[model samples]
Target: VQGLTEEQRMMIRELMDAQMKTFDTTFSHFKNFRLPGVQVRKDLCSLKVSLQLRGEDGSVWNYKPPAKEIFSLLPHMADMSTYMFKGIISFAKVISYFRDLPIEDQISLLKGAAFELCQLRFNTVFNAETGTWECGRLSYCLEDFQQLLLEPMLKFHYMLKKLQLHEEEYVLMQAISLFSPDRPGVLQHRVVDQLQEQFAITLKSYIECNRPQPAHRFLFLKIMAMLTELRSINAQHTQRLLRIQDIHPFATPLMQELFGITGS
Candidate 1:
């Protein structure tokens, strides 16, 4: 393996130190709040082994045949499916956070930790191996491991975004409700005029249209209309938010045609 620069090694040390701190704090908190009869002893033991493998300063990248021979003596670690899933998810978050760092730092950090990271993988598979341990190809193993790590984080990130958008939708509905009634300083006229110019109904029109319906139906229609119009506005906002050089990617032109917006 190629040697890392001094700066790269330093950054790796920092990353490992930070991860150790996070592991310690999280494990301590878990212990403090654990429910009765959680039966997490095996999980905790595995986590400690994994953490030590990653965080110990002099223990990384000195792998030898003897290590594998010794590991072969131990029985296969069991009940690890849950721990593997959670570990991959947590590892992905760490990868993502590192990816978002400055490019130079990212390269440095990854290079410095490559050998240690590989050894960590070796240990994971060692723990997973049956009596006759068989090591898979490094490239295939790395790819599989990375995908396992990434998939959940991607799902989680989108889920959180959708939850936030739902919260915003709720707030927008409340704003429309306040403006619909002739409440004090509700700016009904201004809202009406703006919607008229856009060929969309204001809060006043929305309320009027639903007035004859039952309360449930009225509220439902109000929510539907509010969400529909809000989606239109939100599409525009998304265009801006996701723009690359003031232009959306593949869907930009299509959205513009559908929404009747001018300019690139």
Candidate 2:
């Protein structure tokens, strides 16, 4: 938060611009997804319609859980989910701040934060036109996600379908996620900590000049709260991943990498 000269400001912008360019599509890869049942939109309107129908018949709610357990939804959920995590890490690596962290620290930070950040990236799967969040060609409503949330004790999943973070906001938020202030093994946290702080400030400034949403005044706070929710989910989900690894004879190495699992 120190003052910067005109030259200093110019240099900062130049650097940010270069990094953002490098990040490019890596920052937002949800659109390229062709997973059959996975949602590719943001509307998720059918959830409302499903909620509206009478409860007597099964017409009202169409929330869907993985047909199998946590590890069986997709084709080999463990492996597929791990691959998704792989994509997330790859995308995260493109963020300029992360490049500064030592390789081990970078790996540790991504392992710690990838799940939480996916909670933000999931927005692209929100197919509003069809009112579904497709999981491959399969589909479900936010209510289903809420049902899963119930087990994890997350309160924010309900609001996820309601909020639509702009592209810039998600980008900045992901950067903030990349540089968690509390990631393990921290002798010093400032370089990346300051990076996240700057990203937040940039998002705030972007909101100030560009947005029509007056409620955006509180958007950043709400964003932080959502990140907290994702943080909770990450721990719960990691335990599930561990359990899967224990039971599934075929748990892939990529799966191990995705969750930061160490050992054979």
Best by lDDT: 2
The global C-alpha lDDT for each of the candidates, from Candidate 1 onward, is 0.30, 0.55
Q: How good is model 2 by TM-score?
A: 0.66
Residue-by-residue lDDT tens digits, candidate 1, 1-264: 214445433433444443443332222221111111202122111111111112224433211222111132112121121222233224323533344444443333332222222223223233221211123211111111224323332222222232322222332232232122222222344543342232122323434443444543445354555334433443443344234213323323323332334664
> What number of clashing residue pairs does each candidate have, in the order they appear?
0, 19
The segments of candidate 1 whose C-alpha lies over 4 angstroms from its true place after superposition are 1-4, 18-79, 95-264
Candidate 1 weakest lDDT stretch, 10 residues: 43-52
Candidate 1 versus the native: TM-score?
0.19
Q: Which stretches in model 2 have alpha-carbon errors above 4 Å?
A: 1-71, 128-131, 135-158
Number of clashing pairs, model 2?
A: 19
Worst 10 residues of 2 by lDDT: 43-52
